[PDB]
Design a binder for this molecule. Structure first.
Ligand SMILES: CCCCCCCCCCCCCCCCCC(=O)OC[C@H](CO[C@@H]1O[C@H](CO[C@H]2O[C@H](CO)[C@H](O)[C@H](O)[C@H]2O)[C@H](O)[C@H](O)[C@H]1O)OC(=O)CCCCCCCCCCCCCCCCC
Ligand code: CLA
Ligand code: CLA
Ligand code: CLA
Ligand SMILES: CC(C)=CCC/C(C)=C/CC/C(C)=C/CC/C(C)=C/CC/C(C)=C/CC/C(C)=C/CC/C(C)=C/CC/C(C)=C/CC/C(C)=C/CC1=CC(=O)C(C)=C(C)C1=O
Ligand SMILES: CC(C)=CCC/C(C)=C/CC/C(C)=C\CC/C(C)=C/CC/C(C)=C/CC/C(C)=C/CC/C(C)=C/CC/C(C)=C\CC/C(C)=C/CC1=CC(=O)C(C)=C(C)C1=O
Ligand SMILES: CCCCCCCCCCCCCCCCCC(=O)OC[C@H](CO[C@@H]1O[C@H](CO)[C@H](O)[C@H](O)[C@H]1O)OC(=O)CCCCCCCCCCCCCCCCC
Ligand SMILES: CCCCCCCCCCCCCCCCCC(=O)OC[C@H](CO[C@@H]1O[C@H](CO)[C@H](O)[C@H](O)[C@H]1O)OC(=O)CCCCCCCCCCCCCCCCC
Ligand SMILES: CCCCCCCCCCCCCCCC(=O)OC[C@H](CO[C@@H]1O[C@H](CS(=O)(=O)O)[C@@H](O)[C@H](O)[C@H]1O)OC(=O)CCCCCCCCCCCCCCC
Ligand SMILES: CCCCCCCCCCCCCCCC(=O)OC[C@H](COP(=O)(O)OC[C@@H](O)CO)OC(=O)CCCCCCCCCCCCCCC
Ligand code: HEC
Ligand code: OEX
Ligand SMILES: [Cl-]
Ligand SMILES: [Cl-]
Ligand SMILES: [Fe+2]
Lengths: 33, 176, 97, 334, 137, 51, 36, 244, 30, 152, 32, 51
């Protein structure tokens, strides 16, 4: 189908950037305790 | 008149296809579910605090003690659904958060619709459908519905525009 | 080269009179005495090369010929168009009210 | 210590991470079957001739759909309410064309969901609880029976049941409005009241409790950490909450009994949703919404339009367009 | 606007004579139309044969012309096809066929006039709506 | 003129090398239409590895 | 197809019997208070 | 002996043409004076073959087999018509009327659905000269019309049609129309088909005959959207003859 | 590519379900 | 008439004709305007001048109806053909251009005439390059629109 | 310039994924 | 000479003609092969055949 080719990097970063921020914050919490 | 407003937004704005409306729907239904499921849970994990079969009496508004078992409730839901609340404060804050967020989201979509900035179409579907008369989705089917609504409702609903559509221009399926 | 033949036919006598070779049978209600008996007969005995051929339809009473004669001027004939005659569409073209 | 008693003791064990139980013996398989067929169909099923006119509708991602437009398409109008298991097709190719997966999924899912409700009774009994959570879940479940089974029974065909898709859901509700004027049906009106009110009361209760949490934490930590799992004391002050809310309205419009309040929280949405499930289920038998079309006329007999007439114009545009190649006769009687 | 005698005045026959209905007549004819006729003819159309409606213009082209009190009264007693060629009492309610259409049994001669008059008045009030179908609802 | 190796197929020839040649949709890589591969079609092999 | 039908019939009957016989195996007694 | 409706219903036997016993090897004589009609002609297909597209130069395609996906809805039945005697002893059957079409969809290897209007509409089939008897070696050969699979009111999924519908791609308001012409302008094909009926069984007492048939026609072209495929159909037939 | 994206995200949620159930922070009384 | 003035009298430049996820510049939709084709004048077989009813902003799609100076419908493009009264074929509708690329040209063949009628519902008719940006033909909003949306 | 469209995402991810990995390990070393 | 055999006598199917960052199927390079155009025989003015 003739989709927007940037829809893919839009989607990849949309998942990746906020997810990585949560993962960073959780791992550094666990190694506090 | 409001029913008419709902139908206007379908035929003209295709509002059901809007992801801001969809999050509102999830907020309203998510809140109703939370409401029913939280009340039911509390009422079915009550402590026996009285001898009577009406359990309402067995509450004192000044008692310090929780009137239902958060622990039994948590085991129940963990084993029925896999996850359960464990924190009454988060629980009640979640109940605030969900319906309030849902309604804020839909408000934003309506702001877009003030400008006719609609989630009307999927461009990729229209390109294929235009080129391929055998391609049909529920998406194409609803736009024909929207087109029925616009042509059949606009003369009467927008009298100031003096729309006159002769019979031969009204979009119509077979027989009907 | 690619044309819509039904649109094209609206630009002929078909678009302005009752075409004995093509028009759906409910159009014969527009003039008196034609529907249902004669309209049935006309459609069954199509096609016609001339609007006058209708009068040689075997079995017309003299009353029927005089109704046809009165009405000849509201009739026309054009070439049969497959898209208008296939499907039984001259008896039911899916239009009601 | 007998082999069958051992199995029975594992089935009903309260020490399993997910409770199984006897209802679950039926629920696990039938939900697995429905889920697996749905995932595979949503991704790769070919187009389905939902209305029996050899006009196949594409519903799966691989045939040009996205998440919003995809659906598992209802089974063909040509089948009606006939049972169409796999083994009744000449080939899987045929079963796919005619919409067989839809039937497989909805029948397993309805069974499995019905057993879900029973499983809720069952574990409540093993845990020494009160029984009626499953009664709350009967509201959603009745609603699924309505759009997947009851409405198809009354109209004569699973091809008019709700599609398993986001946009198919919308198609369903548009065509329902034109054939039944559901908006003007008081049971839909009550369901809106159950659902708006449930959200309202959800927000109310969550904000009033949250408003009256007792100080247990500092500014630099979530107040959530002021409640510890299984503490015996209440974590909020309902007398403070009653004192705010009763002054916001007036005293006797506020609950001071937690048991009544939570019962009300349970009752209101459950009952409005019962009615809206009943609404779909009775429009299955064509007892439609109120009809005020041309109800107001003037002294001469001119129609004076109302907003009901405007609704009707919209409804007509939905009626004349839907399933545009499927009607040969003037009345769409089912 | 109102239900004046002009609107209530309709042709009695082909010869051109007229008759002015009372409002009582009109209202009674409307009720009798609902009782005996609307199940097929709601709004001036014909559900079981949409090609034929009750618009005055269609009735004027019917054989025996039916755009008048006498034509319509006769039709209710001995209905024909549109061209007059065949009697259709066996599948159309009429006094001739009240045996098989029992709603016609209790209808007096003045009932038929009321029914007939309502049919002729109504397109004067509603215009295109009467006999136009859903497009005009 | 359009065999698999022109199409960038990497595992398709490893399935073909040991006997898997046909698809549930009824084509074979040898060009024979109408074969009934059984379960052990390209699609059934893939499914088994997923499971 | 008949093989498949056979299998489903047998699978289904098996699970329905588990269910019936399960609940006939003293279910009222499987609670945490008064077993009888 | 014969069957009632309630015996048949649900069995699939409604889609099957009557058979004749294998003892029915007689002959049915023709009196060129008398006139005859086929009172019942029934065509039951058993096989659907589609010609493939071979891409390269002078390879020419093959008729490959297909899977039927529209179930037991395929037979033509109740066909009737003149059976004529010609100056030269040949017989000509002229189709007057009957259930002479069924839409069929078969699927090819690869997933492609191929729809078609299986028909004998306006069939005129003739025998050899000097018949004077219908035997277990009589052949009918003929040709018939194959109208468009959809008729003129049919609306495509964007609402475009021939006798109805939009005349453009309304969802692409300012797109270049030239590229869309083939899909925006519906046309209504009408092609010929060809059929052979081979009589193999004959009941000289009752007038009944039965045999084998092969026909050749075009598939659906979706109102001019794409090129049709060539289709071959095989099956069995049954007819009843009567003095008219 | 869009089909792969959709199914990938779906797959990721199912995997998240598994960890949230079986590898949750266990609730401990007080 | 300057082309610039005429280009404002065209709905593709109307900021209320876009969509939320129709991204990028207006040129990506209708294309890059090259020239004013000219002002289209429709007349029927009787020589009456006819007027295309313009699409209002609310409507994604809109029928093609022609009116006289009085507002009386005299021509349209029908949906159902069977009972049509106002087809361009029946009414002998033609289109003449004054100004622009097509100044002094008259078209009489119904399908070409309908083609321009379908563009006249958007106001003044322009020539667009759609190849350069691979324009998809669907209206996008302007910076006026995007700014208002974002800030509201 | 008619470059490869997937080049953008290949480059973006090539950077993002290993960098994020190092940032995760660094931030949790600091907080212990 | 069968097309299959001719297609093998073509340097575009020689696997040592590619490049590390030239990605995808062979069909993304020279195209999807449709037909053998035939064997070309080159001659000079004197009729002698040239290779
Ligand atoms: C989540 C955690 C929960 C924990 C649970 C633990 C996990 C348990 C693992 C479950 C995983 C489920 C996987 C199910 C995949 C479904 C496979 C399918 O449907 O695949 C089925 C395949 C499909 O077959 C082919 O199906 C094809 C379908 O084509 C379609 O598909 C194609 C795409 O492939 C194209 O689109 C094509 O155009 C389109 O038509 C064609 O129709 C072929 O003719 C046909 O052969 O069937 C076959 O060949 C194979 C089998 C049929 C042989 C026939 C004999 C009858 C079979 C009896 C077996 C019953 C099962 C036994 C029960 C045992 C009880 C002890
Ligand atoms: C499953 C179905 C479903 C669900 C759950 C929703 C849910 C929602 N819809 Mg959608 N909708 C749907 C289907 C659905 N919709 C469909 C199929 C359509 C057709 C396209 C629409 C069309 C539609 C439109 C057109 C709109 C919505 C809106 C909304 C939101 C309404 C919020 C609200 O409470 O307003 C209630 C109103 C308020 C909360 C405002 C203030 C109310 C004050 C406090 C009143 C106080 C009154 C006072 C007490 C005195 C009253 C007295 C008097 C009664 C006697 C909400 C997210 C609206 C939206 O998104 O808005 C942003 C909107 O405009 N929907
Ligand atoms: C005020 C902000 C603003 C405004 C009005 C514009 C307006 C414009 N820009 Mg510009 N731009 C901006 C900021 C802005 N820009 C910024 C900050 C950047 C840096 C990233 C850019 C980068 C940029 C580029 C690279 C380009 C533009 C272009 C354009 C034009 C078309 C844009 C388009 O298609 O939008 C599309 C808009 C959307 C699809 C709407 C997005 C809505 C998101 C997805 C909602 C998120 C919802 C969220 C998850 C809610 C849930 C939360 C809840 C759970 C709590 C238009 C004139 C384009 C152009 O034509 O250039 C010549 C172009 O190529 N801009
Ligand atoms: C054994 C390995 C292997 C092999 C031989 C192939 C082979 C092939 N694949 Mg497959 N593939 C594989 C693994 C493999 N694949 C895996 C694991 C995946 C999942 C990611 C895929 C996904 C995949 C897709 C999605 C596609 C292919 C396609 C293809 C074909 C074209 C390949 C191409 O253009 O490459 C181009 C190769 C490169 C550009 C080389 C990359 C190497 C660079 C230099 C990175 C290394 C630099 C490194 C970081 C340096 C670090 C230094 C530091 C240590 C100090 C070909 C037949 C394509 C095809 O035709 O499909 C039908 C296609 O579309 N493959
Ligand atoms: C294979 C393929 C690809 C398939 C694709 C299939 C497909 C169609 C999928 C599409 C998915 C799709 C796109 C979904 C869209 C959803 C969408 C619109 C997202 C909304 C996003 C958004 C943030 C909306 C804003 C509003 C919002 C915040 C809503 C949140 C709603 C929500 C999560 C509500 C809660 C729901 C829920 C089940 C709660 C259960 C809570 C719980 C366990 C209670 C039990 C319980 C009760 C007690 O009282 C006590 C005491 C205890 C102890 C206890 O436990
Ligand atoms: C010049 C001339 C001629 C003109 C003169 C005109 C003139 C004089 C005008 C001026 C008028 C004047 C001067 C002013 C006086 C006017 C006057 C007083 C007017 C009245 C105004 C009015 C309209 C008020 C609005 C009424 C209003 C909408 C109230 C509705 C109440 C209502 C339906 C509330 C729902 C309550 C409900 C049952 C429960 C809430 C839900 C619920 C479950 C909450 C959860 C909850 C509750 C708890 O309880 C606690 C504990 C907890 C934990 C908890 O979870
Ligand atoms: C860290 C940041 C990155 C992580 C986040 C993930 C990316 C986020 C993705 C969101 C962007 C989605 C854009 C998809 C469009 C795209 O792919 O095309 C890419 C489009 C550009 O458009 C491109 O343009 C090209 C010529 O320039 C051609 O037209 C292409 O066809 C067209 O796609 O990008 C933009 O237009 C970016 C504009 C951003 C401005 C919008 C803000 C105004 C709206 C206000 C929103 C407020 C609401 C907040 C919620 C409350
Ligand atoms: C982890 C997250 C992912 C990491 C970031 C991604 C890094 C990817 C690095 C490769 C770059 C991608 C190539 C450019 C994009 C491109 O189009 O690719 C996409 C290409 C396919 O290419 C596309 O193909 C399409 C049809 O399939 C079309 O033809 C398109 O034209 C074409 O772009 O796919 C790949 O090449 C797949 C990669 C498989 C390569 C394996 C063979 C090499 C193995 C050697 C490893 C040894 C090296 C050791 C070093 C020490
Ligand atoms: C001509 C007309 C004739 C009549 C018409 C017939 C119809 C009338 C039906 C009346 C049915 C009786 C219902 C009241 C009983 C009740 O529920 O009490 C049970 C408790 C006990 O109250 C509690 O009472 C307790 C004392 S005791 O338990 O009751 O003894 C006390 O402890 C506590 O504080 C107090 O709050 O009441 C509540 O907690 C208060 C809320 C009641 C919930 C109403 C349900 C809402 C459903 C509407 C959903 C639709 C919207 C969508
Ligand atoms: C046989 C039974 C099978 C049932 C399977 C169902 C499993 C799925 C349930 C959700 C697992 C994931 C929840 C993770 C998140 C999770 O772990 O939360 C766990 C969380 C625990 O709450 P506590 O009160 O312990 O935590 C409070 C403190 O952490 C404060 O920080 O529970 C809640 O928040 C529940 C309310 C939100 C729950 C809403 C979940 C339902 C949403 C479903 C979304 C579906 C989208 C589908 C798209 C494809
Ligand atoms: C209640 C007593 C009435 C009255 C006053 C009329 N009808 Fe009927 N109608 C029906 C059908 C199928 C036809 C067409 C018959 C034919 O020509 O084949 C009619 C026709 C009429 C007419 C004539 C209309 C015209 O244009 O000439 C009239 C005046 C008329 N009807 C009056 C069907 C039905 C019904 C279905 C069961 C019933 C009931 C009625 N008609 C009832 C009435
Ligand atoms: O299917 Mn679905 O839809 Ca309930 O009506 Mn009839 O049918 Mn169809 O049409 Mn309207
Ligand atoms: Cl529909
Ligand atoms: Cl019908
Ligand atoms: Fe609570």
């Amino acid at each position: 189908m003739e989709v927007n080719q940037l829809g893919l990097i839009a989607t990849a970063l949309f998942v990746l950037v906020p997810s990585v921020f949560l993962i960073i914050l959780y791992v550094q919490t666990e190694s506090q305790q | 008149a409001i029913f008419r407003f709902l139908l206007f937004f379908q035929g003209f704005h295709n509002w059901t296809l809007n992801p801001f409306h969809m999050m509102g729907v999830a907020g309203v239904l998510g809140g109703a579910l939370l409401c029913a499921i939280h009340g039911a849970t509390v009422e079915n994990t009550l402590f026996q605090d009285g001898e009577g079969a009406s359990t309402f009496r067995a509450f004192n508004p000044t008692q310090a003690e929780e009137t239902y078992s958060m622990v039994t409730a948590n085991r129940f839901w963990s084993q029925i659904f896999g996850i359960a609340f464990s924190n009454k404060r988060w629980l009640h804050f979640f109940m605030l958060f969900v319906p309030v967020t849902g309604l804020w989201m839909s408000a934003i979509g309506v702001v877009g619709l003030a400008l006719n900035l609609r989630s009307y179409d999927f461009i990729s579907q229209e390109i294929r459908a235009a080129e391929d008369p055998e391609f049909e989705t529920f998406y194409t089917k609803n736009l024909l519905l929207n087109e029925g609504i616009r042509a059949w409702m606009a003369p009467q609903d927008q009298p100031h525009e003096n729309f006159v559509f002769p019979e031969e221009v009204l979009p119509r399926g077979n027989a009907l | 080269e690619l044309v819509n033949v039904v649109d094209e036919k609206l630009g002929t006598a078909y678009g302005e009179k009752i075409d004995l070779n093509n028009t759906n049978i409910a159009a014969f209600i527009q003039y008196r005495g034609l529907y249902p008996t004669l309209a049935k007969l006309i459609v069954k005995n199509a096609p016609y090369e001339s609007v006058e051929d209708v009068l040689n339809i075997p079995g017309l009473t003299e009353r029927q010929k005089q109704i046809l004669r009165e009405n000849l001027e509201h009739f026309t004939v054009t070439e049969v168009e497959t898209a208008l005659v296939e499907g039984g569409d001259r008896y039911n073209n899916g239009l009601y009210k | 210590a007998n082999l069958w008693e051992r199995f029975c003791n594992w089935v009903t064990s309260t020490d399993n991470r997910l409770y199984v139980g006897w209802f679950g013996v039926i629920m696990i398989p039938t939900l697995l079957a429905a889920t697996i067929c749905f995932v595979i169909a949503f991704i790769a099923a070919p187009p389905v001739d939902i209305d029996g006119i050899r006009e196949p509708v594409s519903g799966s991602l691989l045939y040009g759909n996205n998440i919003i437009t995809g659906a598992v398409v209802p089974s063909s109008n040509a089948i009606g309410l006939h049972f169409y298991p796999i083994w009744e097709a000449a080939s899987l190719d045929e079963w796919l064309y005619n919409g067989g997966p839809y039937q497989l999924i909805i029948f397993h899912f309805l069974l499995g969901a019905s057993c879900y409700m029973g499983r809720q009774w069952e574990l409540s009994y093993r845990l020494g609880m009160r029984p009626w959570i499953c009664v709350a879940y009967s509201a959603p479940l009745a609603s699924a029976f309505a759009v997947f089974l009851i409405y198809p029974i009354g109209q004569g065909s699973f091809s008019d049941g709700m599609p398993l898709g986001i946009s198919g859901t919308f198609n369903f509700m548009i065509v329902f409005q034109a054939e039944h004027n559901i908006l003007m049906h008081p049971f839909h009106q009550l369901g809106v009241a159950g659902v708006f009110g449930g959200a309202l009361f959800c927000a109310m209760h969550g904000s009033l409790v949250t408003s009256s949490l007792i100080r247990e934490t500092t500014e630099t930590e979530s107040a959530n950490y002021g409640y510890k799992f299984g503490q015996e004391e209440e974590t909020y002050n309902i007398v403070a909450a009653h004192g705010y809310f009763g002054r916001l309205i007036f005293q006797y419009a506020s609950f001071n009994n937690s048991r009544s309040l939570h019962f009300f929280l349970a009752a209101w949405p459950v009952v409005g949703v019962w009615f809206t499930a009943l609404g779909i289920s009775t429009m299955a038998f064509n007892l439609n919404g109120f009809n005020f079309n041309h109800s107001v006329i003037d002294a001469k007999g001119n129609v004076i339009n109302t907003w009901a007439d405007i609704i009707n114009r919209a409804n007509l545009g939905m009626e004349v367009m839907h399933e545009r190649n499927a009607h040969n006769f003037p009345l769409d009687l089912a | 606007a109102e239900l004046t005698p002009e609107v209530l005045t309709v042709p009695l026959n082909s010869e051109g004579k007229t008759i002015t209905l009372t409002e009582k007549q009109y209202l009674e004819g409307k009720r009798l139309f609902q009782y005996a006729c609307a199940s097929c003819h709601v709004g001036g159309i014909t559900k079981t044969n949409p090609s034929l409606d009750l618009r005055t213009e269609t009735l004027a082209l019917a054989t025996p012309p039916r755009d008048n009190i006498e034509g319509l009264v006769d039709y209710m007693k001995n209905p024909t096809t549109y061209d007059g060629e065949q009697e259709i009492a066996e599948v159309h309610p009429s006094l001739r066929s009240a045996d098989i259409f029992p709603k016609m049994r209790n209808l007096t001669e003045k009932d038929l006039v009321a029914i007939a008059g309502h049919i002729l008045v109504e397109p004067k009030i509603l215009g295109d709506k009467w006999g136009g179908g859903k497009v005009y609802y | 003129l359009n065999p698999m190796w022109r199409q960038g197929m990497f595992v398709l020839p490893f399935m073909a090398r040991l006997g898997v040649t046909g698809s549930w949709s009824g084509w074979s890589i040898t060009g024979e239409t109408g074969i009934d591969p059984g379960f052990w079609s390209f699609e059934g092999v893939a499914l088994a590895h997923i499971v | 197809m008949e093989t498949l039908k056979i299998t489903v019939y047998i699978v289904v009957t098996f699970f329905v019997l588990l269910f019936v016989f399960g609940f006939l195996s003293g279910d009222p007694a499987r609670n945490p208070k008064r077993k009888d | 002996q014969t069957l009632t409706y309630d015996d048949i219903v649900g069995t699939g036997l409604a889609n099957k043409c009557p058979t004749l016993d294998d003892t029915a090897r007689g002959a049915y004589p023709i009196d060129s004076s008398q006139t005859y009609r086929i009172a019942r002609l029934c065509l039951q297909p058993t096989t659907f073959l589609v010609k493939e597209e071979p891409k390269n130069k002078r390879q020419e395609a093959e008729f490959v087999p297909t899977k039927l996906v529209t179930r037991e809805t395929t037979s033509l039945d109740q066909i009737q018509g003149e059976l004529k005697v010609n100056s030269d002893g040949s017989l000509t059957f002229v189709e007057e009327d009957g259930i002479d079409f069924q839409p069929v969809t078969v699927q090819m290897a690869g997933g492609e659905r191929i729809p078609l209007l299986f028909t004998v509409k306006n069939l005129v089939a003739s025998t050899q000269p000097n018949v004077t008897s219908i035997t277990t070696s009589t052949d009918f050969k003929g040709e018939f019309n194959v109208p468009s699979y959809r008729t003129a009111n049919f609306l495509d999924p964007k609402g475009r049609g021939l006798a109805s519908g939009y005349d453009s791609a309304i969802a692409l308001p300012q797109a270049k129309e030239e590229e869309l012409a083939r899909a925006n302008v519906k046309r209504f094909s009408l092609t010929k088909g060809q059929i052979s009926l081979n009589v193999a069984k004959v009941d000289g007492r009752t007038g009944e005959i039965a045999g084998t048939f092969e026909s050749e026609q075009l598939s659906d072209d979706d109102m001019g959207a794409h090129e049709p495929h060539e289709v071959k159909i095989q099956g069995v037939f049954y007819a009843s003859i009567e003095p008219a | 590519m869009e089909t792969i994206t959709y199914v990938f995200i779906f797959a990721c949620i199912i995997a998240l379900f598994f960890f949230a159930i079986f590898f949750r922070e266990p609730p401990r009384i007080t | 008439i300057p082309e610039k003035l005429a280009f404002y009298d065209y709905i593709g430049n109307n900021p209320a004709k876009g969509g939320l996820f129709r991204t990028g510049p207006m040129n990506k939709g209708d294309g890059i305007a090259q020239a004013w084709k000219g002002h289209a004048v429709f007349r029927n077989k009787e020589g009456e001048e006819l007027f295309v009813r313009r699409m209002p902003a609310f409507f994604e799609s809109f029928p093609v109806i022609l009116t006289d100076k009085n507002g009386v419908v005299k021509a349209d493009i029908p949906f159902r053909r069977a009972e049509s009264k106002y087809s361009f074929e029946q009414q002998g509708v033609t289109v003449s251009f004054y100004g622009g690329e097509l100044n002094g040209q008259t078209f009489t063949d119904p399908p070409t005439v309908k083609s321009y009628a379908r563009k006249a519902i958007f106001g003044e008719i322009f020539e667009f390059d759609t190849e350069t940006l691979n324009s998809d033909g669907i209206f996008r909003t302007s910076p006026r629109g995007w700014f208002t949306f974002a800030h509201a």
